[model samples]
Target: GSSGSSGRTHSGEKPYECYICHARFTQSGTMKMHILQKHTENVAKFHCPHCDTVIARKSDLGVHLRKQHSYSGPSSG
Candidate 1:
């Protein structure tokens, strides 16, 4: 299946290369997403509701809360 062969490079494999940046990814979708997120000048418009901190993505807000505001209830989760 393609999933099993995804990480492998064949002798005649047509490698997917990014024209804007030389960075390469195993999948085209991943490469496209990376380009949109990293290469574009579109500022991160999302912000944390609890705090006024801004982030590039929703995942970053979650990470900020977990790292800054997380408190252990007698034991580490």
Candidate 2:
């Protein structure tokens, strides 16, 4: 049966739970780093080309560009 397969089982559970929000992670060490990098108030490294906004991650930059500059044409680079 499918339930008898060992490949379908999961031993590791979510050990890291965020205190400030409803976020949970699997690795406690990685979760600690994420909290420090994301939750802490600091200078943003990523900048938006279409607006005066700065974020900590490159994903944020992409989202900002998509929303603010969606009408712009594609560039060749």
Candidate 3:
């Protein structure tokens, strides 16, 4: 029983599981990637207040605002 899983870490920990299909992921990034890959349409879109550029991820939007608009405040929504 000590063989462990083929695609797991040394301790064999898979903490993230999909709510819809029960697929497991060891890391949060992996889980997020899976969720985005399967549920791309479910992603929340963020729009730039200075321009019309939109993004799916918050970090991307932040970068866009910082580099493109020189704004360093919280997004409007």
Candidate 4:
């Protein structure tokens, strides 16, 4: 898993991005972990009540609900 600084990656760079959240990671392994622990269902454990989407983390489920299902839950504000 080679990510960041295409030709030279010695100074700490994050080239890997999550297709789910668009988050950046320094290493592809870290990105994979992030996805498994935050997006996939078999790992984090969270079932989507709306669709067949199996989200890993609760926050990701919340995001999915709010973004796609028109969730009217409390907001940070």
- What are the clash counts of all predictions, listed in order? 0, 0, 0, 0
List model 3 lDDT by residue over 55-76, tens digit each. Answer: 7676686687678868676778
The Cα error of candidate 2 at residue 77, in Å, is 35
Candidate 4 lDDT tens digits, 1-77? 87775564555578888877888887766776687667665454665654666776776777887887887857787
Q: How many backbone clashes does candidate 1 have?
A: 0
Per-residue C-alpha lDDT of model 1 across residues 5-61, encoded as one tens digit per residue: 347545543356555676766666566556555754443454444455666775565
Native-to-model Cα distance after best TM-score fit, residue 67 in candidate 4, in Å:
38
Which portions of model 1 show Cα errors greater than 4 Å?
Answer: 1-14, 42-77
Q: For residues 1-77, what per-residue lDDT tens digits would candidate 2 score against the true structure?
A: 35553456556678777664646788766665465457655434644433556656865655666776674568977
- lDDT: worst 10-residue window of model 3: 45-54
Off by over 4 Å in 3: 1-12, 42-77
**CA lDDT scores, all candidates in order:** 0.58, 0.59, 0.66, 0.71
lDDT of 4 at 37: 68
Error of 1 at 74 (Å): 30
Position 72, candidate 3: lDDT: 75
Model 4 root-mean-square deviation: 11.7
How far out, in Å, is residue 9 in model 3? 17
